[PDB]
Symmetry: C2
Subunit: 186 residues, 2 copies
């Protein structure tokens, strides 16, 4: 909904400019142009709001990658699909991406937010483990290969968001080829 979305957008801008601990529900109500009582109809408190935001973002990233996932294709294509859908999600949901990326291990996260994230991670662990066994990927610990793919992307999104680097189809194409070469057997 446009109400839910403006509450989350207004909450993200305040969490970034005034910190999560410093932000309150009335501040989000003022920036979203709604009543504090209407926010309390959707969310019991700020911790419920930030867990609805985190969870929805994770399931949107999970939907984006899992939608049209090329199950019958090779490792190369499954990687290409995952990488581009991951980059496209980050690119279009930078605040949510930068916010979700910055709070995966936060103290305010609830059991469902953690189960959503672990179920998402585990999906790629199993593909990576299958790739290692077939001799298709480097025999590195699966968590080391996720780090190799994810950390450069995560930082490049941050650097693009500051305007230090600029997005282009050519840049993602170069970054995707680089990440595939980093994890495959040569």
């Amino acid at each position: 909904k446009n109400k839910q979305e403006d509450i989350f957008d207004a909450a993200m801008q305040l969490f970034a400019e005034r910190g999560y601990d410093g932000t309150t529900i009335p501040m989000i109500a003022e920036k979203a142009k709604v009543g504090a009582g209407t926010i309390y109809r959707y969310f019991e408190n700020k911790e419920a709001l930030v867990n609805s935001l985190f969870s929805k973002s994770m399931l949107q990233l999970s939907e984006m990658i899992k939608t049209d996932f090329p199950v019958e294709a090779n490792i190369r294509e499954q990687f290409s699909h995952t990488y581009n859908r991951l980059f496209e999600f980050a690119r279009n949901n930078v605040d949510a991406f930068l916010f979700t990326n910055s709070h995966c291990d936060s103290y305010f996260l609830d059991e469902q937010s953690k189960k959503i994230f672990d179920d998402f991670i585990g999906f790629f662990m199993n593909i990576i483990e299958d790739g290692i066994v077939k001799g298709l990927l480097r025999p590195l610990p699966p968590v080391a290969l996720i780090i190799i793919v994810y950390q450069p992307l995560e930082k490049l999104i941050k650097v693009i968001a500051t305007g230090q680097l600029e997005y282009s189809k050519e840049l993602v194409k170069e970054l995707e080829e680089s990440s595939w070469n980093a994890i495959r057997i040569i």
Copy 2:
């Protein structure tokens, strides 16, 4: 013989900068965690900006030394990469605290002119090698800062993951991470 309390002060400051943020941390807080008097910290450093600049400068110069020592100038970019990567991993492995801090605050507002000149002289050295590699058609035609990120960010996170005990260090782990990073930046 008068022992240098700077190591204990830097360790105490980083634990507070990590748990309470650099802006939230003060000199009395560092004095309490270091188990020293506030006045003894002010003997070494005029303020928190001086302390943090000393910490930054010292770490960057110890990392610079670790890579520039026995640097294989007459070797190919493959060997120069291998040398750089291993010396970088060895420095990070043995100086876990300071390495993470320093390379995450290399564009911070609190860095003085000398800290910035130390860092710019260090990074520019690798920018030149990367630019030569791109021109020769050996490295990927990516912005040089994107190739530094590709090499550095996975390493930085693997050090953090090893530091939690989730992953364990081994000579074969670094050998494989080094081959992976070279394959990430070269034209195959």
